[PDB]
CSV table of C-alpha atoms and ligand atoms in Angstrom, one decimal:
chain,number,residue,atom,x,y,z
A,1,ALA,CA,15.4,20.7,43.2
A,2,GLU,CA,15.4,23.9,40.7
A,3,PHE,CA,15.9,27.1,43.0
A,4,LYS,CA,14.6,30.0,40.9
A,5,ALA,CA,14.9,33.6,42.4
A,6,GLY,CA,11.6,35.0,44.1
A,7,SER,CA,10.5,37.7,46.2
A,8,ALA,CA,13.2,38.4,48.9
A,9,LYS,CA,10.5,40.4,50.5
A,10,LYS,CA,8.4,37.4,51.4
A,11,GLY,CA,11.2,35.2,52.0
A,12,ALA,CA,12.3,37.7,54.7
A,13,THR,CA,8.8,37.2,56.0
A,14,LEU,CA,9.2,33.4,56.0
A,15,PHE,CA,12.4,33.5,57.6
A,16,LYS,CA,11.2,35.7,60.4
A,17,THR,CA,7.8,33.6,61.0
A,18,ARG,CA,9.4,30.0,60.6
A,19,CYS,CA,13.2,30.1,61.3
A,20,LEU,CA,14.2,33.1,63.3
A,21,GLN,CA,12.6,31.2,66.4
A,22,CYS,CA,15.9,29.2,66.0
A,23,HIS,CA,18.1,31.0,63.7
A,24,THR,CA,19.9,34.6,63.0
A,25,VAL,CA,21.5,35.3,59.6
A,26,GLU,CA,23.6,38.4,60.4
A,27,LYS,CA,27.6,38.4,60.4
A,28,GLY,CA,28.4,37.6,64.0
A,29,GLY,CA,24.6,37.0,64.9
A,30,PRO,CA,23.9,34.8,68.0
A,31,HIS,CA,23.8,30.9,67.9
A,32,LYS,CA,20.4,30.0,69.5
A,33,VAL,CA,18.5,26.9,69.4
A,34,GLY,CA,20.2,26.4,65.6
A,35,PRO,CA,23.5,28.1,64.5
A,36,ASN,CA,23.9,31.5,63.2
A,37,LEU,CA,23.7,31.1,59.3
A,38,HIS,CA,25.9,33.8,58.0
A,39,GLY,CA,28.1,32.2,55.3
A,40,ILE,CA,26.1,28.9,55.2
A,41,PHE,CA,26.3,29.3,51.3
A,42,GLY,CA,29.5,27.9,49.8
A,43,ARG,CA,30.4,26.2,53.0
A,44,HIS,CA,30.2,22.6,54.1
A,45,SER,CA,27.7,21.3,56.7
A,46,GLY,CA,28.2,21.6,60.2
A,47,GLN,CA,30.8,24.3,60.3
A,48,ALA,CA,29.5,27.5,61.8
A,49,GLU,CA,32.2,28.6,64.5
A,50,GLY,CA,31.0,28.2,68.1
A,51,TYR,CA,27.9,25.7,67.6
A,52,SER,CA,27.8,22.1,68.5
A,53,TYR,CA,26.3,20.2,65.7
A,54,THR,CA,25.2,16.4,65.4
A,55,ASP,CA,27.5,14.3,63.8
A,56,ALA,CA,25.1,13.5,61.2
A,57,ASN,CA,25.0,17.0,60.2
A,58,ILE,CA,28.7,17.5,59.8
A,59,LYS,CA,29.1,14.1,58.3
A,60,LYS,CA,26.5,14.9,55.3
A,61,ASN,CA,29.2,17.2,54.5
A,62,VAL,CA,27.2,18.8,51.8
A,63,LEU,CA,28.5,22.0,50.0
A,64,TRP,CA,25.3,24.1,50.2
A,65,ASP,CA,23.7,25.6,47.4
A,66,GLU,CA,20.4,27.3,46.4
A,67,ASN,CA,19.6,23.5,44.9
A,68,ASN,CA,20.3,21.1,47.5
A,69,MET,CA,19.2,23.8,50.4
A,70,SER,CA,15.7,23.6,48.5
A,71,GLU,CA,15.8,19.7,48.7
A,72,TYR,CA,17.0,19.9,52.5
A,73,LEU,CA,14.3,22.6,53.6
A,74,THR,CA,11.5,20.4,52.0
A,75,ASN,CA,12.1,17.7,54.7
A,76,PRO,CA,15.5,18.1,56.8
A,77,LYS,CA,15.2,14.9,58.3
A,78,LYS,CA,15.3,13.0,54.8
A,79,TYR,CA,18.1,14.9,53.6
A,80,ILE,CA,20.2,14.9,56.9
A,81,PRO,CA,19.1,11.8,58.9
A,82,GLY,CA,19.5,12.1,62.6
A,83,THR,CA,19.5,16.0,62.5
A,84,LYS,CA,18.5,17.7,65.4
A,85,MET,CA,16.9,20.3,63.6
A,86,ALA,CA,12.9,20.1,64.4
A,87,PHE,CA,11.5,21.2,61.6
A,88,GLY,CA,9.0,19.3,59.3
A,89,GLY,CA,9.9,21.2,56.1
A,90,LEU,CA,8.4,23.7,53.6
A,91,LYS,CA,6.5,21.8,51.2
A,92,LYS,CA,6.0,24.6,48.6
A,93,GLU,CA,8.4,25.1,46.1
A,94,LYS,CA,7.5,28.9,45.7
A,95,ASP,CA,7.9,29.2,49.6
A,96,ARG,CA,11.4,27.6,49.2
A,97,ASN,CA,12.4,29.7,46.5
A,98,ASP,CA,11.4,33.1,48.2
A,99,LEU,CA,13.1,32.0,51.4
A,100,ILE,CA,16.2,30.9,49.5
A,101,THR,CA,16.2,34.2,47.7
A,102,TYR,CA,16.2,36.0,51.0
A,103,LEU,CA,18.7,33.8,52.4
A,104,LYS,CA,21.2,34.1,49.6
A,105,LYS,CA,21.6,38.0,50.4
A,106,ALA,CA,20.9,38.1,54.4
A,107,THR,CA,23.6,35.4,55.2
A,108,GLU,CA,26.3,37.6,53.6
B,1,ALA,CA,24.8,20.6,42.6
B,2,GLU,CA,24.4,23.5,40.2
B,3,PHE,CA,24.0,22.1,36.6
B,4,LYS,CA,25.7,24.5,33.9
B,5,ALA,CA,25.0,23.5,30.1
B,6,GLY,CA,27.9,21.8,28.3
B,7,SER,CA,28.7,19.9,25.3
B,8,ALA,CA,26.3,17.5,24.0
B,9,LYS,CA,28.9,15.7,22.1
B,10,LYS,CA,30.9,15.2,25.0
B,11,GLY,CA,28.1,14.0,27.0
B,12,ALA,CA,27.4,11.5,24.0
B,13,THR,CA,30.6,9.9,24.6
B,14,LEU,CA,30.3,9.9,28.2
B,15,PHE,CA,27.1,8.0,28.0
B,16,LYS,CA,28.5,5.4,25.8
B,17,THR,CA,31.6,4.6,28.0
B,18,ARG,CA,29.9,5.0,31.2
B,19,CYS,CA,26.3,4.4,30.8
B,20,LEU,CA,25.5,2.4,27.9
B,21,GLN,CA,26.5,-1.0,29.7
B,22,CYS,CA,23.3,-0.8,31.8
B,23,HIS,CA,20.9,1.9,30.0
B,24,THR,CA,19.2,3.1,26.7
B,25,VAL,CA,18.0,6.2,26.1
B,26,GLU,CA,15.5,5.9,23.3
B,27,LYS,CA,11.7,5.8,23.2
B,28,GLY,CA,10.7,2.2,23.5
B,29,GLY,CA,14.5,1.0,24.2
B,30,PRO,CA,15.4,-2.0,26.1
B,31,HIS,CA,15.9,-2.4,30.0
B,32,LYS,CA,19.8,-3.8,29.9
B,33,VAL,CA,20.6,-3.7,33.7
B,34,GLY,CA,19.2,-0.4,34.4
B,35,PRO,CA,15.9,1.0,33.2
B,36,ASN,CA,15.7,2.6,29.8
B,37,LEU,CA,16.0,6.2,30.6
B,38,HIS,CA,13.8,7.9,27.7
B,39,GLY,CA,11.3,10.5,29.7
B,40,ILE,CA,13.4,10.8,32.7
B,41,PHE,CA,13.5,14.5,33.4
B,42,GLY,CA,10.5,15.6,35.0
B,43,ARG,CA,9.4,12.5,36.1
B,44,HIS,CA,9.6,10.9,39.7
B,45,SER,CA,12.3,7.9,40.1
B,46,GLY,CA,10.9,4.4,39.7
B,47,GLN,CA,8.5,4.9,37.0
B,48,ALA,CA,10.1,3.3,33.7
B,49,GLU,CA,7.3,1.2,32.2
B,50,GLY,CA,8.5,-2.6,32.8
B,51,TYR,CA,11.1,-2.2,35.1
B,52,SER,CA,11.7,-3.5,38.4
B,53,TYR,CA,13.2,-1.0,40.6
B,54,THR,CA,14.3,-1.5,44.4
B,55,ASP,CA,11.6,-0.1,46.9
B,56,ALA,CA,14.5,2.5,47.8
B,57,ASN,CA,14.4,4.1,44.3
B,58,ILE,CA,10.5,4.2,44.4
B,59,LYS,CA,10.3,5.5,47.9
B,60,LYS,CA,13.1,8.1,47.2
B,61,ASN,CA,10.2,9.4,44.7
B,62,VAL,CA,12.8,12.2,43.4
B,63,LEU,CA,11.3,14.4,40.7
B,64,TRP,CA,14.6,14.2,38.5
B,65,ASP,CA,15.9,17.5,37.3
B,66,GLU,CA,19.2,18.7,36.1
B,67,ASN,CA,20.7,19.4,39.5
B,68,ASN,CA,19.5,16.6,41.5
B,69,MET,CA,20.8,14.7,38.4
B,70,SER,CA,24.3,15.8,38.9
B,71,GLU,CA,24.1,15.4,42.7
B,72,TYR,CA,23.1,11.5,42.2
B,73,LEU,CA,25.5,10.9,39.5
B,74,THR,CA,28.1,12.1,41.7
B,75,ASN,CA,27.7,9.5,44.3
B,76,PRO,CA,24.3,7.6,43.5
B,77,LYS,CA,24.6,5.5,46.9
B,78,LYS,CA,24.7,8.6,48.8
B,79,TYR,CA,21.6,10.0,47.1
B,80,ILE,CA,19.7,6.9,46.8
B,81,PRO,CA,20.6,4.7,49.9
B,82,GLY,CA,19.8,1.1,48.8
B,83,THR,CA,20.0,1.5,45.1
B,84,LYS,CA,21.0,-1.4,43.0
B,85,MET,CA,22.7,0.8,40.6
B,86,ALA,CA,26.4,-0.2,41.1
B,87,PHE,CA,28.1,2.9,39.8
B,88,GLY,CA,30.7,4.7,42.0
B,89,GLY,CA,29.9,8.0,40.8
B,90,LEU,CA,31.2,10.7,38.2
B,91,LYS,CA,33.5,12.8,40.1
B,92,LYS,CA,34.3,15.3,37.4
B,93,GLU,CA,31.9,18.3,37.5
B,94,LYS,CA,32.4,19.1,33.8
B,95,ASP,CA,31.7,15.4,32.5
B,96,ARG,CA,28.4,15.6,34.8
B,97,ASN,CA,27.4,18.6,33.0
B,98,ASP,CA,28.2,17.5,29.4
B,99,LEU,CA,26.7,14.2,30.2
B,100,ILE,CA,23.2,15.7,31.5
B,101,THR,CA,23.3,18.2,28.4
B,102,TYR,CA,23.2,15.2,26.3
B,103,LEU,CA,21.0,13.2,28.5
B,104,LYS,CA,18.3,16.0,28.5
B,105,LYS,CA,18.4,15.8,24.8
B,106,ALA,CA,18.8,12.1,23.8
B,107,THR,CA,16.0,11.0,26.4
B,108,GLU,CA,13.5,12.8,24.3
C,1,LIG,O1,5.3,23.5,54.7
C,1,LIG,S1,3.8,24.1,54.7
C,1,LIG,O2,3.4,24.7,55.8
C,1,LIG,O3,3.8,25.0,53.6
C,1,LIG,C1,2.9,22.9,54.1
C,1,LIG,C2,2.0,22.9,53.1
C,1,LIG,C3,1.1,21.7,52.9
C,1,LIG,C4,1.0,20.7,53.4
C,1,LIG,O4,-0.2,19.9,53.3
C,1,LIG,C5,1.5,20.9,54.8
C,1,LIG,C6,2.5,21.7,55.1
C,1,LIG,S2,1.1,19.8,56.3
C,1,LIG,C7,2.0,18.4,56.3
C,1,LIG,C8,3.1,18.1,57.1
C,1,LIG,C9,4.0,17.1,56.8
C,1,LIG,S3,5.4,16.9,58.0
C,1,LIG,O5,5.4,18.5,58.5
C,1,LIG,O6,4.9,16.2,58.8
C,1,LIG,O7,6.3,16.5,57.2
C,1,LIG,C10,3.6,16.1,56.1
C,1,LIG,C11,2.6,16.2,55.3
C,1,LIG,C12,2.0,17.2,55.4
C,1,LIG,O8,0.7,17.4,54.5
C,1,LIG,S4,2.1,14.7,54.3
C,1,LIG,C13,2.9,15.4,52.7
C,1,LIG,C14,4.2,15.7,52.2
C,1,LIG,C15,4.9,15.9,51.2
C,1,LIG,S5,6.5,16.2,51.1
C,1,LIG,O9,7.1,16.1,52.5
C,1,LIG,O10,6.7,17.5,50.5
C,1,LIG,O11,6.9,15.0,50.3
C,1,LIG,C16,3.9,16.6,50.2
C,1,LIG,C17,2.5,16.1,50.4
C,1,LIG,C18,2.0,15.8,51.6
C,1,LIG,O12,0.7,15.8,51.8
C,1,LIG,S6,1.7,16.6,49.0
C,1,LIG,C19,1.3,18.2,49.0
C,1,LIG,C20,2.5,19.0,47.8
C,1,LIG,C21,2.3,20.4,47.9
C,1,LIG,S7,3.1,21.0,46.5
C,1,LIG,O13,3.2,22.6,46.6
C,1,LIG,O14,4.4,20.9,46.4
C,1,LIG,O15,2.5,20.6,45.3
C,1,LIG,C22,1.8,21.4,48.7
C,1,LIG,C23,0.9,20.7,49.9
C,1,LIG,C24,1.0,19.2,50.1
C,1,LIG,O16,0.4,18.7,51.2
C,1,LIG,S8,0.5,21.6,51.4
C,2,LIG,O1,27.9,21.5,20.4
C,2,LIG,S1,28.6,20.5,20.7
C,2,LIG,O2,29.6,20.4,22.1
C,2,LIG,O3,27.7,19.2,21.2
C,2,LIG,C1,29.5,19.6,19.4
C,2,LIG,C2,28.6,19.1,18.3
C,2,LIG,C3,29.4,18.8,17.4
C,2,LIG,C4,30.7,18.5,17.1
C,2,LIG,O4,31.3,18.1,16.2
C,2,LIG,C5,31.5,19.0,18.3
C,2,LIG,C6,30.9,19.5,19.3
C,2,LIG,S2,33.4,18.9,18.3
C,2,LIG,C7,33.9,17.0,18.8
C,2,LIG,C8,33.7,16.8,20.1
C,2,LIG,C9,34.3,15.6,20.7
C,2,LIG,S3,34.1,14.9,22.3
C,2,LIG,O5,33.8,16.3,23.1
C,2,LIG,O6,33.5,14.0,22.4
C,2,LIG,O7,35.6,14.9,23.0
C,2,LIG,C10,34.8,14.9,19.8
C,2,LIG,C11,35.0,15.2,18.3
C,2,LIG,C12,34.6,16.3,17.9
C,2,LIG,O8,34.7,16.7,16.5
C,2,LIG,S4,36.1,14.0,17.4
C,2,LIG,C13,34.6,13.2,16.6
C,2,LIG,C14,34.2,11.8,16.5
C,2,LIG,C15,33.4,10.9,15.9
C,2,LIG,S5,33.3,9.5,16.1
C,2,LIG,O9,34.5,8.8,15.6
C,2,LIG,O10,32.4,8.9,15.0
C,2,LIG,O11,32.9,9.2,17.3
C,2,LIG,C16,32.4,11.8,15.0
C,2,LIG,C17,32.7,13.4,14.8
C,2,LIG,C18,33.7,13.7,15.4
C,2,LIG,O12,34.0,15.2,15.3
C,2,LIG,S6,31.7,13.9,13.8
C,2,LIG,C19,30.5,14.7,14.7
C,2,LIG,C20,29.4,13.9,15.8
C,2,LIG,C21,28.4,14.2,16.6
C,2,LIG,S7,27.5,13.2,17.8
C,2,LIG,O13,27.8,13.7,19.0
C,2,LIG,O14,26.3,12.9,17.2
C,2,LIG,O15,28.3,11.8,17.5
C,2,LIG,C22,28.1,15.6,16.6
C,2,LIG,C23,28.9,16.3,15.7
C,2,LIG,C24,29.9,15.9,14.7
C,2,LIG,O16,30.8,17.1,14.2
C,2,LIG,S8,28.4,18.1,16.1
C,3,LIG,O1,35.3,11.3,36.7
C,3,LIG,S1,35.5,10.2,37.6
C,3,LIG,O2,34.6,9.5,38.2
C,3,LIG,O3,36.1,9.3,36.6
C,3,LIG,C1,36.9,10.7,38.6
C,3,LIG,C2,37.4,11.9,38.5
C,3,LIG,C3,38.5,12.3,39.7
C,3,LIG,C4,38.7,11.2,40.5
C,3,LIG,O4,39.9,11.9,41.4
C,3,LIG,C5,38.3,10.0,40.3
C,3,LIG,C6,37.2,9.8,39.5
C,3,LIG,S2,38.8,8.8,41.7
C,3,LIG,C7,37.8,8.8,43.3
C,3,LIG,C8,37.0,7.8,43.4
C,3,LIG,C9,36.4,7.9,44.4
C,3,LIG,S3,35.1,6.6,44.8
C,3,LIG,O5,35.7,5.2,44.3
C,3,LIG,O6,34.8,6.4,46.3
C,3,LIG,O7,33.9,6.7,44.2
C,3,LIG,C10,36.5,8.7,45.6
C,3,LIG,C11,37.2,9.7,45.2
C,3,LIG,C12,38.0,10.1,44.3
C,3,LIG,O8,38.9,11.0,44.1
C,3,LIG,S4,37.5,11.1,46.5
C,3,LIG,C13,36.7,12.5,45.8
C,3,LIG,C14,35.5,12.6,46.0
C,3,LIG,C15,34.9,13.9,45.3
C,3,LIG,S5,33.1,13.7,45.1
C,3,LIG,O9,32.8,12.5,45.4
C,3,LIG,O10,32.7,14.3,43.8
C,3,LIG,O11,32.7,14.8,46.2
C,3,LIG,C16,35.5,14.8,45.0
C,3,LIG,C17,37.0,14.7,45.0
C,3,LIG,C18,37.4,13.4,45.4
C,3,LIG,O12,39.0,13.4,45.5
C,3,LIG,S6,37.6,16.2,44.2
C,3,LIG,C19,37.6,16.0,42.6
C,3,LIG,C20,37.1,16.9,42.0
C,3,LIG,C21,36.9,17.2,40.6
C,3,LIG,S7,36.4,18.4,39.7
C,3,LIG,O13,36.3,18.1,38.3
C,3,LIG,O14,34.8,18.4,40.3
C,3,LIG,O15,36.7,19.8,40.2
C,3,LIG,C22,37.7,16.2,39.9
C,3,LIG,C23,38.4,15.1,40.4
C,3,LIG,C24,38.3,14.9,42.0
C,3,LIG,O16,39.3,14.0,42.7
C,3,LIG,S8,39.3,13.7,39.6
C,4,LIG,C1,14.1,25.1,65.8
C,4,LIG,C2,12.9,24.3,66.2
C,4,LIG,C3,14.7,25.2,64.4
C,4,LIG,C4,13.9,25.6,63.5
C,4,LIG,C5,12.3,26.8,63.4
C,4,LIG,C6,15.0,26.1,62.4
C,4,LIG,N1,16.2,25.6,62.5
C,4,LIG,FE1,17.6,25.1,61.3
C,4,LIG,N2,18.8,24.1,62.6
C,4,LIG,C7,18.1,24.0,63.9
C,4,LIG,C8,19.2,23.1,64.7
C,4,LIG,C9,19.1,22.6,66.3
C,4,LIG,C10,20.3,22.8,63.6
C,4,LIG,C11,21.6,22.0,64.0
C,4,LIG,C12,21.2,20.5,63.2
C,4,LIG,C13,22.2,19.3,63.7
C,4,LIG,O1,21.7,18.3,63.4
C,4,LIG,O2,23.4,19.6,64.2
C,4,LIG,C14,20.0,23.6,62.6
C,4,LIG,C15,20.4,23.3,61.1
C,4,LIG,C16,20.2,24.4,60.0
C,4,LIG,C17,21.1,24.2,58.8
C,4,LIG,C18,22.4,23.7,58.5
C,4,LIG,C19,23.5,24.4,59.1
C,4,LIG,C20,24.8,23.9,58.6
C,4,LIG,O3,24.9,22.9,58.0
C,4,LIG,O4,25.9,24.7,59.1
C,4,LIG,C21,20.3,25.0,58.0
C,4,LIG,C22,20.7,25.5,56.4
C,4,LIG,C23,19.1,25.4,58.6
C,4,LIG,N3,19.4,25.0,60.1
C,4,LIG,C24,18.3,26.2,58.0
C,4,LIG,C25,17.0,26.7,58.5
C,4,LIG,C26,15.9,27.1,57.8
C,4,LIG,C27,16.0,27.9,56.5
C,4,LIG,C28,14.9,27.3,58.6
C,4,LIG,C29,13.4,28.1,58.6
C,4,LIG,C30,12.7,27.2,57.1
C,4,LIG,C31,15.1,26.7,60.0
C,4,LIG,N4,16.5,26.1,59.7
C,4,LIG,C32,14.4,26.5,61.1
C,4,LIG,C33,17.1,24.2,64.5
C,4,LIG,C34,16.1,25.0,63.8
C,5,LIG,C1,25.4,-0.8,35.6
C,5,LIG,C2,26.7,-1.2,36.3
C,5,LIG,C3,25.0,0.7,35.6
C,5,LIG,C4,25.4,1.9,35.1
C,5,LIG,C5,26.8,1.4,34.5
C,5,LIG,C6,24.6,2.6,35.1
C,5,LIG,N1,23.3,2.5,35.6
C,5,LIG,FE1,21.9,3.8,36.2
C,5,LIG,N2,20.9,2.4,37.1
C,5,LIG,C7,21.4,1.1,37.2
C,5,LIG,C8,20.5,0.1,37.8
C,5,LIG,C9,20.4,-1.2,38.3
C,5,LIG,C10,19.1,1.2,38.2
C,5,LIG,C11,17.9,0.9,39.0
C,5,LIG,C12,18.6,1.2,40.5
C,5,LIG,C13,17.4,0.8,41.4
C,5,LIG,O1,17.6,1.0,42.7
C,5,LIG,O2,16.2,0.4,41.2
C,5,LIG,C14,19.6,2.5,37.7
C,5,LIG,C15,19.1,3.6,37.7
C,5,LIG,C16,19.3,5.1,37.4
C,5,LIG,C17,18.8,6.2,37.4
C,5,LIG,C18,17.3,6.2,37.9
C,5,LIG,C19,16.1,5.6,37.3
C,5,LIG,C20,14.7,6.3,37.6
C,5,LIG,O3,14.5,6.6,38.7
C,5,LIG,O4,13.9,6.0,36.7
C,5,LIG,C21,19.3,7.0,36.6
C,5,LIG,C22,18.7,8.4,36.5
C,5,LIG,C23,20.3,6.3,36.1
C,5,LIG,N3,20.3,4.9,36.7
C,5,LIG,C24,21.4,7.2,35.5
C,5,LIG,C25,22.7,6.4,35.0
C,5,LIG,C26,23.7,7.4,34.5
C,5,LIG,C27,23.9,8.7,33.7
C,5,LIG,C28,24.6,6.4,34.2
C,5,LIG,C29,26.0,6.7,33.4
C,5,LIG,C30,26.8,7.8,34.3
C,5,LIG,C31,24.4,5.1,34.6
C,5,LIG,N4,23.1,5.5,35.1
C,5,LIG,C32,25.1,3.9,34.7
C,5,LIG,C33,22.6,0.4,36.6
C,5,LIG,C34,23.6,1.2,35.9
């Protein structure tokens, strides 16, 4: 994947309408169906404190960056087989770019 | 992974010592053990004319770019499970960057 910075505004709206049902981003924000995502970039997968991950999420042991996050979000189950994240994926490169542009700033 | 442009000259040495046994780069070059790699960037995996890939490499259908190339070369069997490319991986990040710098130029 080739992440390129897009519209953080449109990405905020994508997060709100497709991810917020299971995730928060803010420092200290609640765990819900999925883990709070503060600090996700530059951390290995499966390490938010207080959350119970699948073994596959921890064991994939990917160091998240803008590029492997784009590949993951295209089809989560294909990048992390066995993940309990119920999400088919964002197929459009432009939507992933916008969303990841937002995530990069909102999760710090 | 995050590609960062490096030294084409060092990349060329890395290709000769670590890849040339199994691959060539020139247009019309021979399939040795692995496919000739001319045109690899911006093409999906498993498409070099005349080579017989594993089903795994074809099904992967990755659109090759500098970032997923670096991730692949770090550990090919992790990125394309089932591949017949017998190569443990290039663990040094600078070597990956240099080699991809060379590959982008030499496969065109
Ligand atoms: O995520 S969105 O809500 O935005 C979304 C956008 C599009 C869309 O059709 C859908 C959902 S609906 C859908 C849902 C699921 S799933 O949820 O069950 O997995 C699987 C499929 C599927 O069709 S099959 C399929 C899978 C993939 S892949 O997974 O990316 O390899 C690519 C294409 C394709 O047909 S082709 C293709 C290529 C592009 S482009 O922009 O990359 O050129 C865009 C689209 C394509 O269909 S529009
Ligand atoms: O901007 S770049 O970083 O890409 C870059 C471009 C060039 C360059 O010199 C360098 C760095 S500096 C350099 C780097 C490395 S290293 O990084 O590999 O350790 C080893 C050496 C070296 O001098 S020693 C050496 C060994 C041989 S050999 O005995 O024939 O193998 C030929 C040449 C040579 O200098 S001459 C030669 C050969 C080539 S080539 O790649 O077409 O073979 C290119 C050039 C040459 O001057 S331009
Ligand atoms: O380039 S070479 O392929 O010749 C090569 C270079 C280095 C090296 O140790 C080896 C081979 S030997 C080796 C072989 C195998 S294998 O046989 O199972 O494949 C597994 C490992 C292993 O260590 S374990 C391991 C795996 C990875 S990862 O796979 O990249 O995540 C990173 C590191 C690490 O320890 S840490 C690490 C980080 C860097 S840096 O430059 O990126 O900072 C460099 C090195 C590191 O060890 S030097
Ligand atoms: C409920 C149906 C979810 C939706 C919608 C989204 N996510 Fe998700 N996510 C969910 C769960 C239950 C988990 C844990 C999965 C496991 O196997 O343990 C996750 C995980 C992630 C991760 C990895 C977190 C980490 O490694 O620490 C990421 C990066 C992630 N989720 C991102 C994400 C995005 C960007 C979403 C909108 C496109 C999204 N998720 C939606 C549950 C659900
Ligand atoms: C023999 C021991 C090999 C070594 C050394 C290298 N490669 Fe390889 N490669 C090899 C095979 C048999 C295959 C086909 C694998 C399959 O499952 O069909 C490949 C494939 C690749 C690819 C993908 C090709 C494509 O999708 O068209 C790439 C990008 C690739 N090889 C790169 C590569 C590099 C950079 C190497 C040096 C670090 C290297 N290979 C060494 C066999 C062998």
